[PDB]
Amino acid sequence: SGALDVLQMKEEDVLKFLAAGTHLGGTNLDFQMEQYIYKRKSDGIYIINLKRTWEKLLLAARAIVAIENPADVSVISSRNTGQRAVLKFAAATGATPIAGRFTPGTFTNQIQTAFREPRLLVVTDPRADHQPLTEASYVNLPTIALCNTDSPLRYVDIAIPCNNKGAHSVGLMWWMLAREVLRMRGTISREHPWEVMPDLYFYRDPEEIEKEEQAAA
Amino acid sequence: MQNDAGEFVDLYVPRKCSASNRIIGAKDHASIQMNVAEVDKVTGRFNGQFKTYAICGAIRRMGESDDSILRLAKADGIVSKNF
Amino acid sequence: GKCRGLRTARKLRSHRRDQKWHDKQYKKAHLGTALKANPFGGASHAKGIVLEKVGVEAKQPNSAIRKCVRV
Amino acid sequence: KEWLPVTKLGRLVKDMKIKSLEEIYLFSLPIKESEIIDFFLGASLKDEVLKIMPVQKQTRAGQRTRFKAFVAIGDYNGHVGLGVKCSKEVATAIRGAIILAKLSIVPVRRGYWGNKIGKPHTVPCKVTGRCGSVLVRLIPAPRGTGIVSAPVPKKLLMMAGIDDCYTSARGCTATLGNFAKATFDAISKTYSYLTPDLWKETVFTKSPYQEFTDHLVKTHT
Amino acid sequence: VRMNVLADALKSINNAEKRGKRQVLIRPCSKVIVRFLTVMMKHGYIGEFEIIDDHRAGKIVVNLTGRLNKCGVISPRFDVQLKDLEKWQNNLLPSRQFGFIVLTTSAGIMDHEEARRKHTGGKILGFFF
Amino acid sequence: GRVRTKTVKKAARVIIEKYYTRLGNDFHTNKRVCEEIAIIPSKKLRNKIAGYVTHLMKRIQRGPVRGISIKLQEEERERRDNYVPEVSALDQEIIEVDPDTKEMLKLLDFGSLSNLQVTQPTVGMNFKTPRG
Amino acid sequence: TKKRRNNGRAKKGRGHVQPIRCTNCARCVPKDKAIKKFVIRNIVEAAAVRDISEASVFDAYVLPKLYVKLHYCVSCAIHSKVVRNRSREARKDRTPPPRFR
Amino acid sequence: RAKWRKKRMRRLKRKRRKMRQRS
RNA sequence: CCAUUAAUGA
RNA sequence: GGUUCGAAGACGAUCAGAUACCGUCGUAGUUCCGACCAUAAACGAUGCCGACUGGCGAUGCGGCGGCGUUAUUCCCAUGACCCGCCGGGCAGCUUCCGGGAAACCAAAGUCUUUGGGUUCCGGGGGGAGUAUGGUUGCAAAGCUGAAACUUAAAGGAAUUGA
């Protein structure tokens, strides 16, 4: 990642970043998220620097691969945008998913049935998953967060500045992170593109599901 | 912590944060050892050796954790110098 | 202290000399009004003459008729 | 009688693949099982009850008195704790206080005053601790002095093994719960104060969760 | 107004150490401040610093580490002999192992162990540990 | 006031979760089915459980139920998750590019690209909701 | 104890305002402390608009209004149920009630 | 009420001043 | 619209 | 000079009683000028000056920079809007910086790891802001200001019932 020709930024990755809209940040501005924005556009929407986004994705991929056991890595999403993304990420990696209904106390209450003592937390949204930050304040749990330009950095541990609102952008960044950790650990080589299509990770509107069911038959 | 003879006499030696240069107490239950992996320059895969880092709880509850991790990784050579 | 100068010793001494009088024990020890109003006169014992014997009703919850002597 | 493990650290204790609680205090792992300290330091561990405090709340059918137990716990070498538990009966209150005390013991620090020959005896520097308005200050003392203190924190320091210490108290020290928690916070911050003898860099050893990560998934879920 | 420039600068670096900044800009530059910073340098509590010397009250940038617990000040400049310095380090320093009380003398601005070596008392300035 | 309690409802959910194939739509059939599969000591509680089973089966025929784990609905959920659509909306011949994004891409390594389309900037800086 | 940050009123740097008499009582209230209702009022609301729309001379004549800025005190506002007491966690929520009806 | 206690004491002070001024 | 007061100790 | 309102006072109601709340009046007063007194829950119950320590959306002042809309239309430039920046002015929102007994406080923080400089003021509650002495004032009153004696409580924050 540091002056390495292998871990550079790819032209197709630039095309998919521009097609998803991950650089298109939020309207407001956070005081901690100032060092990941190059220039403010017209209409008051910030530009997330895609190269520094790729660098923070590489560092979070280092943090994922450095954990030896993939089974005790909890990947969390409470909004409806990221549930299918974290479920298919856990199915592709070996992680443990949370897709809605995060019970407060799964990291602190032992008598509960869904008690886990993990080694790594990967957070979709900080304001939606502020409660795993509160359990990670008491259990020694590192935090990976897909932050926005407005998302604060309270109790997080490493962050990737992205657009946490667009359903294409969130799933595209989960796809980039999943392909990066599969290229790092000894499963999939870096020469060929990955076979499973990145539209698998996108959450579908049920109106779009009914429209596709109408258009299929 | 050595005595007149020179023996290590304290019953443990505490951890120290690599960002604020401050030790970590016994019930500082938010201190995290970050592990950064390594990538070979000719293969591009995981090697086996790590880079360890300490984060105390005050930096987490303040909000300067990932900035300190980014600065330590840029100093140790993980993040590129362009950034 | 409040003022922390290098030569405020007379100010601190005069302020503490004026504020010792607001203590109850210092005033009772260093004014002669309480020593004059003390029937013993700063003494421990005193002889006197019995003139009458008074039954004094007691205070709050504990009630009795105590036996005092006007000396 | 046979203890069934629940936590991962408790499973490591039942596997005996960690040599002491020193690595647990190094990596700051939360101890949430009361049998771990009975396993490690349970031979010389001592329980002494400080005060049974009868707190109560007012209901519509009079008052409801429930007893609050304070237990000072610890062997005479380096590790003590203070446990607080309020329950309906005093026996269950003292038992729960001993359990929470075993969950929340802390390591205490002993150092030298001036000459550094022999074993460490005193608190190495002027430290302090407070909760509420009770302020307890711990002062280094020379050799042969003793624990010049009130009887309850003198009992706590006699448990802690600090032979020589001067103390200072500020506030309404009649509240023995806040008084014991204030001296508990002082002896906990002894191992939190930055000592200039700790200028050596910390070579971080491997966590036991990362050491035995294969046994922890092959012997149970 | 600004009465004690040394006390203001040391309270500034004390606030910087309490928050956790890597470096801080204290706004004036005095000779007592520069000599105090060199004493903390030679005793190894802070890093190496620099001063910005315009033709006014200059500025000072000090690279800070976590080895400085609290940097205080003793105002005003009390006289300290060799008979009372034991009581000074008894009621001001945290221990007799570390911590140094600076005090200016005619031989130079120095701390209490160097004052015991050179056998010379003087006016106290502050403490640092 | 005809409201079922938790001892009816949780037991009926366990019955439908474990024996979904044996249960049906008719009340007088799945009542006897629940009688044979579950030991219910009273006819009134048996009728309450059977009625709540019929009402949950009506909810299943109307749509999905949250507090249930049916194997067929789980297989349908897994199929709808593993469904692969047609070619992506990320692969487009025309991608709208803002001028400041074009400037930062020029400052990066890939400055000139193949299938990008730079657009005009939104003139008029009016993007905030008025106050009050 | 100090119950409100702005102490029961809307003064922070003024210090003194002019008094206004109440409408229900004749209580002398400070201007920024008084509960103010800018009551809009169509002179007929439901019943007589149907009568005026057929008894008026001009075709499609718009009905007039009557604007009154009422000033109440704390006692008059709570006795006429303009404002109510709230929980201490909901005291700081100074959003106005909406215009749903 | 402290206000009427102060006003009662002012009237009592006026009575004391009048009874001293009579002498 | 009017509505005053519940003797001391436990 | 007295329009309105309205201490004292009169009258009519309610009440066992009203020498109050309610209503009709109504003197002094409330309005202006020349002389008094210096008292307020005169409060932000938080003295004045100086340095440091999170941001966020504003607003007011003056200045600066930059797409554009709109008037002097006949351009530049000045007025009105939009986005920022600069110094403090009243402020507001979040909060494990930190403090406090807590309510709360970006100060009520930089406090047992106690020292930036400086004026006033408190030493349990009553007696009591009382007596006396001095002083100011036409008076009412204001400033300084006790003691004897009496009591083990008085008080502040917060919790649960009623």
Numbering used by the authors:
A (entry chain q): 2 to 218
B (entry chain HH): 1 to 83
C (entry chain VV): 2 to 72
D (entry chain v): 58 to 278
E (entry chain TT): 2 to 130
F (entry chain YY): 2 to 133
G (entry chain ZZ): 2 to 102
H (entry chain n): 2 to 24
Paper quotes:
During this temporary pause in translation, HR2 is exposed outside the ribosome exit tunnel and can recruit the signal recognition particle (SRP). As a result, the paused XBP1u ribosome-nascent-chain mRNA complex (XBP1u-RNC) is targeted to the Sec61 protein-conducting channel on the ER membrane, where mRNA splicing by IRE1α is now possible.
We structurally characterized the paused ribosomal complex (XBP1u-RNC) by cryo-EM and single particle analysis using a mutant version of XBP1u (S255A, full length numbering), which was shown previously to pause ribosomes more efficiently than wildtype XBP1u. In both states we observed strong density for the XBP1u chain, which was connected to tRNA and extended down the ribosomal exit tunnel. A major portion of the XBP1u peptide in the exit tunnel was resolved to between 3.0–3.5 Å for both classes, whereas the resolution in the part distal to the PTC near the exit was worse than 4 Å, apparently due to flexibility of the nascent chain. In both states, we observed that the ribosomes are paused with Met260 connected to the tRNA in the P-site, in full agreement with findings from ribosome-profiling analysis of mouse embryonic cells. In the following sections, we will refer to the post-state paused RNC complex for further analysis and discussion, since the nascent chain conformation is indistinguishable in both states. Since we detect a substantial fraction of the RNCs in the rotated state we cannot exclude that the XBP1u structure may also perturb translocation as well as preventing rapid A-site tRNA accommodation. However, we do not observe any perturbation of the P-tRNA 3'-CCA end pairing with the P-loop in 28S rRNA, as was seen in other cases.
